[PDB]
Amino acid sequence: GSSGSSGYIGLVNSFAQKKKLSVNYEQCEPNSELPQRFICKCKIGQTMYGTGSGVTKQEAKQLAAKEAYQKLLKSPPKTAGTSGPSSG
Numbered sequence: 653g654s655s656g657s658s659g660y661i662g663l664v665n666s667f668a669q670k671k672k673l674s675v676n677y678e679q680c681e682p683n684s685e686l687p688q689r690f691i692c693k694c695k696i697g698q699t700m701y702g703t704g705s706g707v708t709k710q711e712a713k714q715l716a717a718k719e720a721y722q723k724l725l726k727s728p729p730k731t732a733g734t735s736g737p738s739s740g
Contacts, residue, residue: 664694664702664717664724671729673697675720677713694720696729 668675678693692713694702702719704712 660718660721661714664720667724673729692716696720
């Protein structure tokens with residue numbers, strides 16, 4: 653394959669869960685009748701991270717993540733701090 657053994661498309665999905673975050677995918681259609689292109693915006697906790705756009709929803713939603721990923725690596729979720737014997 654290419655662009656990673658699996659890709660970022662999934663990175664986010666697993667990323668959010670790890671950071672007990674909330675990932676959402678909004679689907680908005682282009683006012684203009686044609687052409688017809690699906691769009692999916694990835695929002696993490698009511699926050700705009702990435703936005704994918706393609707001929708099909710899937711293709712869109714997918715890419716969306718790719719953007720959300722890099723966005724995290726640059727600007728992660730400002731957290732206070734984790735601490736506890738629950739796990740070490």
